[PDB]
Design a protein around this nucleic acid. Structure first.
Ligand SMILES: [Mg+2]
Ligand SMILES: [Mg+2]
Ligand SMILES: [Mg+2]
Ligand SMILES: [Mg+2]
Ligand SMILES: [Mg+2]
Ligand SMILES: [Mg+2]
Ligand SMILES: [Mg+2]
Ligand SMILES: [Mg+2]
Ligand SMILES: [Mg+2]
Lengths: 87, 95, 97, 66, 68, 250, 81, 287
RNA sequence: AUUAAACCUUGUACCUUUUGCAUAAUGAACUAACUAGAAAACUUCUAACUAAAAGAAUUACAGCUAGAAACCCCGAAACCAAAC
């Protein structure tokens, strides 16, 4: 038994790598992971393409009908769809 | 020689050097000429004169003699009536 | 090579315990105290190396002088053998003459 | 040092060490025929000059009245 | 915390125990007794007359002086 | 009634003195009660951090004795005989089962015995370091001169709150002139605190000043410190140890 | 570790404890005191100082006795030292 | 100055910020790497790589240089030759100017030592100080000085200004006491007597021209005048001087200190002096 | 390199020792752990004080005090003392 904790700390990182390869994790949507602000992300989307958008309209586009159903089911235990814009 | 002695842990002087040379405080060493008392009857008058002199030592010989003596033999001595009083220093030396 | 499979238990160090808090006090006993005591007298350790330092050969010879007559037979036999080995190394061997 | 490098040192200087360097260069330059080579140590507050100029500097400092 | 009292040298004359086997020998000589009076004057208790040579010692001193 | 103090010793003509606020601890708000002068040669020396490095390392190293040890091939049990003969066996040549190459053998170059690290810095150099450390605390606003250490109450909590009130550091070092006469109230309050330490004036050292954030000096100690340090300047070399009688020295 | 006392003092310590202590005082004194025998096999120095001939300076001198072996038969007779 | 202003801005000084002076420490090199490993600087196989080259001075079998030179007595008797430290008139004038010696009172070795004017090493066979003529032309002081040895020109300079110089002898034991008197008093012993010069030095100290302390006082007046004639100055008369008593003060040839006699004990603790009352003791010390 | 694992092109195992040369000759089945440069006389660098330096004993015609900087491992045939 050698003195020191730094080698033990390093090896924990490699055990993490081995576990991931053998058992890949299920996908998750970026919203769950840290460093997320919805308002800021939307604005950068428009500026990225060198096009100007109205914030109220652009946000409505992303909302989907299936999303509304899930929220209400959770709520029991307003929004507005993008159907008009899609057509 | 002895670099570290058992009883005191110091360097030791080689006493055969102390019995043959003289050290001037500047760093020069003096000696005699080998054979200056041997078979004088077969030596010319000019040869005998050269033998009687006191002579200096070279740089490499001076370096070796310094290693073989300790610091006590390198100090300043103030002897009243010293006949080497004027030879302990150097003058007008650019070097 | 083989490495630990778990982290060792954590080490917790108190930096304000009595020994650490008051380290250094009275190191100026002489200059601020009229020189009645020398700072070396504040040292704790073996009798033969309080306020003194030397190489290994010097340490061996000094230890014998102070406590040589109060030593066990076998310990003294080993000390004497160490001295002679160190004597021959320091006076006969090495790169520089 | 080295047995052949001769220097002179002015030691206990307070204030602006750089001003003293300028004065020494002006004072000593006419004698040498060139600007003297000097080193300034800000931490220890000393000035070092190449060559022996102790007597002239001692007299020079007395005139200024230090 | 509060630091302990500063270390201090012990004051006053020192008279070692003669019987004790582990008392250093140099502390038991007449020279050591003389030193106590020199440092601490009369508080030592050393009979002042003892400092000078005794008549038997005096003869030895004089005899040596003539010889050399 | 302002408390005004002047340096007993002669300040050099070319140097103006330096000053600090005198304070008292009797109340939470008695921050300023006086004005004091401090000898420039003590509290306004050049900012030399290399010297501070030397004295701090000297303090830590001159006491060190290491007790690590190992056995050589001579001191390990057994090993006298030659294991097998030089020729015929077909193994490597060997002469003892306790050489460094073998398992269970001796160590070739290991630590040997108790070893000391003792050395002494020159007395003038150690004295200079104390002046530089005192200067650093003043210029960085970590020094607080006080008239006396008297306290209203012996409750430890009172002292802690006072430090918070006056923007002191988490660790405070308190200096008093002598150990024997230190006030009773202070002793009881500090004794139960890890980070607030009380020492006599003779115990002041460079290492503790670095460890503790803020320094507190009583006025009598200021005169005490000024006297000793300035003596190191303008003195002769010793003919014999200073503890022996001298014409003008205690 | 170390012994509490030096080796050469062990003999005195033994006489100071046990039934040895109960012995009468002056006989313990006889054992304790050791006086050097009169010279027999070497010449003692007459003086304490002598003039070294080579350098012509005054030097201290001492008397160092020869070691002599006494066979156990000597204890049955009267040899003159 | 401006430097202390910088400290105010910078972060606190602590045990985590220390740094040594640059270039104060070199790097120590170990033999691990390829540059300093492998043969490790010792060369190819031989006596020198293994570590057993011959000793210093060995020349491979021919008779060595330091042993083929004949013996000669340059250093014979060196440990028995006497040594005198030099004190020049430049140094002496410098010391009086800065106040480190008091010219009003008599000057002896104790006063010179106490002012750091001279450093005396009795264990290295120092027997005292000799006055040296260097700086004579600018000597302008009136003093009473005692030294072990003196030169012709040095005596002239002192007296031309109206001063007294004399030569006195101290033995090795007395000299040690004279230089460091206080440690002796701490011992607790009586003050010893002063021995007379060895035989070889008796002629020197009994000769008036040398200003000896055992010479006939009647012969001094003649000798002083001849210096004045030789060196072209007028012999001043000091008896008229106000400080004749100070200039004429001289100690007994068996005394070490001015106001103390052999056989006394100095009790420094309570400021007292003890004197013996025994006839045998008093006769011994007074002889 | 290639769309393509192999095919096509290029290429006289490693350490030591030898004449700076090896298809010469020593050594190595493989894995893990263990296994070999150590001292301060002189010199250079960094500071304190300076005709003086050093916390007693030492050196000094700019010196003196302190710090830092260094010199391997394994292997005989033998010789002697005392037992068995
Ligand atoms: Mg063995
Ligand atoms: Mg055997
Ligand atoms: Mg072997
Ligand atoms: Mg082991
Ligand atoms: Mg190394
Ligand atoms: Mg000297
Ligand atoms: Mg072969
Ligand atoms: Mg093979
Ligand atoms: Mg391995």
């Amino acid at each position: 038994v050698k003195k020191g904790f730094r080698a033990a700390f390093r090896f924990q990182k490699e055990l993490e790598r081995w576990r991931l390869l053998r058992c890949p994790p299920p996908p998750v949507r970026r919203s769950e992971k840290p460093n997320w602000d919805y308002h800021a992300e939307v604005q950068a989307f428009g500026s990225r393409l060198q096009e100007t958008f109205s914030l109220d309209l652009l946000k409505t586009a992303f909302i989907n009908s299936c999303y509304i159903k899930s929220e209400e089911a959770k709520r029991q235990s307003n929004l507005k769809d993008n159907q008009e814009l899609f057509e | 020689l002895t670099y570290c002695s058992t009883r005191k842990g110091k360097r030791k002087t080689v006493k055969s050097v102390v019995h043959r040379f003289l050290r001037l405080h500047s760093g020069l060493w003096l000696r005699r000429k080998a054979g200056y008392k041997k078979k004088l009857w077969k030596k010319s008058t000019a040869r005998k004169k050269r033998l009687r002199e006191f002579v200096f030592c070279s740089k490499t010989q001076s370096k070796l003699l310094d290693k073989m003596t300790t610091s006590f033999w390198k100090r300043r001595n103030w002897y009243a009536g010293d006949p080497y009083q004027m030879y302990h220093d150097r003058t007008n030396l650019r070097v | 090579a083989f490495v630990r499979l778990t982290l060792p238990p954590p080490k917790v160090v108190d930096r304000w315990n009595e020994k650490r808090a008051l380290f250094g006090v009275y190191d100026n006993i002489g200059i601020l105290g009229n020189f009645e005591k020398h700072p070396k007298e504040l040292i704790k350790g073996p009798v033969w190396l309080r306020g003194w330092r030397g190489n290994e050969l010097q340490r061996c010879v000094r230890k014998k002088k102070f406590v040589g007559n109060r030593m066990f037979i076998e310990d003294l036999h080993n000390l004497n053998k160490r001295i002679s080995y160190l004597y021959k190394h320091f006076n006969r061997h090495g790169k520089y003459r | 040092t080295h047995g052949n490098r001769q220097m002179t040192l002015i030691r206990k200087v307070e204030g602006d060490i750089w001003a003293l360097q300028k004065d020494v260069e002006e004072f000593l330059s006419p004698l040498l025929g060139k600007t003297p080579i000097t080193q300034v140590n800000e931490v220890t507050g000393t000035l070092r000059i190449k060559g022996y100029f102790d007597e002239q500097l001692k007299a020079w400092l007395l005139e200024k009245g230090f | 915390y509060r630091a302990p009292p500063p270390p201090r040298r012990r004051p006053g004359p020192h008279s070692p125990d003669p019987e004790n086997l582990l008392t250093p020998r140099w502390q038991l000589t007449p020279r050591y007794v003389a030193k106590q009076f020199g440092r601490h004057g009369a508080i030592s208790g050393v009979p002042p007359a003892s400092l000078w040579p005794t008549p038997e010692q005096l003869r030895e001193l004089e005899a040596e002086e003539q010889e050399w | 009634d302002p408390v005004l103090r002047k340096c007993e010793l002669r300040i050099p003509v070319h140097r103006r003195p330096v000053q600090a606020w005198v304070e008292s601890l009797r109340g939470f708000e008695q921050e300023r009660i006086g004005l004091a002068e401090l000898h420039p040669d003590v509290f306004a020396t050049a900012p030399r951090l290399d010297i501070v490095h030397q004295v701090a390392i000297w303090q830590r190293n001159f006491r060190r004795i290491s007790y690590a040890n190992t056995k050589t091939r001579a001191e390990v049990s057994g090993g006298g005989r030659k294991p097998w003969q030089q020729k015929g066996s077909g193994r490597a040549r060997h002469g003892s089962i306790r050489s460094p190459l073998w398992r269970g053998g001796g160590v070739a170059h290991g630590p040997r015995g108790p070893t000391s690290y003792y050395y002494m810095l020159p007395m003038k150099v150690r004295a200079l370091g104390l002046k530089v450390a005192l200067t650093v605390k003043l210029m960085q606003d970590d020094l607080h001169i006080v008239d006396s250490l008297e306290l209203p109450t012996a409750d430890p909590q009172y002292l802690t709150e006072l430090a918070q009130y006056r923007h002191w550091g988490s660790s405070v070092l308190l200096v008093d002139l002598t150990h024997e006469e230190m006030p009773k109230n202070v002793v009881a309050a500090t004794s139960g605190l890890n980070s607030f330490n009380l020492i006599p004036a003779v115990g002041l050292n460079v290492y503790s000043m670095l460890k503790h954030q803020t320094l507190v000096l009583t006025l009598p100690s200021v005169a005490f410190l000024e006297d000793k340090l300035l003596w190191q300047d303008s003195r002769y070399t010793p003919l014999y140890p200073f503890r022996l009688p001298y014409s003008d020295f205690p | 570790p170390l012994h509490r006392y030096p080796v050469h003092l062990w003999q005195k310590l033994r006489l100071r404890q046990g039934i040895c202590a109960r012995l009468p005082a002056h006989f313990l004194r006889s054992l304790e005191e050791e006086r050097t025998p009169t010279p027999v096999h070497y010449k003692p120095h007459g003086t304490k100082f002598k003039i070294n001939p080579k350098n012509g300076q005054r030097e201290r001198v001492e008397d160092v006795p020869i070691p002599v072996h006494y066979p156990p038969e000597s204890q049955q007779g009267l040899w003159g030292g | 100055g401006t430097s202390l202003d910088l400290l105010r801005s910078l972060p606190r000084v602590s045990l985590a910020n220390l740094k040594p002076s640059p270039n104060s420490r070199k790097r120590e090199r170990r033999p691990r790497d390829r540059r300093r490993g492998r043969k490790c600087g010792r060369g190819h196989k031989g006596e020198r790589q293994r570590g057993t080259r011959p000793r210093l001075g060995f020349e491979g079998g021919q008779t060595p240089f330091y042993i083929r030179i004949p013996k000669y007595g340059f250093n014979e008797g060196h440990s028995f030759r006497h040594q005198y430290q030099p004190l020049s008139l430049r140094r002496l004038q410098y010391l009086i100017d800065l106040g480190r010696v008091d010219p009003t009172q008599p000057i002896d070795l104790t006063q010179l030592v106490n002012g750091r004017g001279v450093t005396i090493q009795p264990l290295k066979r120092d027997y005292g100080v000799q006055l040296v003529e260097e700086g004579a032309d600018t000597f302008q002081a009136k003093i009473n000085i005692e030294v072990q040895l003196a030169s012709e020109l040095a005596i002239a300079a002192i007296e031309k200004n109206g001063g007294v110089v004399t030569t006195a002898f101290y033995d090795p034991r007395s000299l040690e006491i004279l230089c460091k008197p206080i440690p002796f008093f701490l011992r607790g012993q009586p003050i010893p007597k002063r021995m007379l010069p060895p035989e070889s030095l008796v002629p020197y100290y009994t000769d008036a021209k040398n200003r000896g302390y055992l010479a006939d006082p009647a012969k001094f007046p003649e000798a002083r005048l001849e210096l004045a004639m030789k060196f072209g100055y007028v012999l001043p008369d000091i008896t008229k001087d106000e400080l004749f008593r100070m200039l004429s003060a001289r100690k007994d040839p068996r005394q070490i200190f001015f106001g103390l006699a052999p056989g006394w004990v100095v009790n420094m603790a309570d400021k007292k002096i003890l004197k013996p009352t025994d006839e045998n003791l008093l006769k011994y010390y007074s002889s």
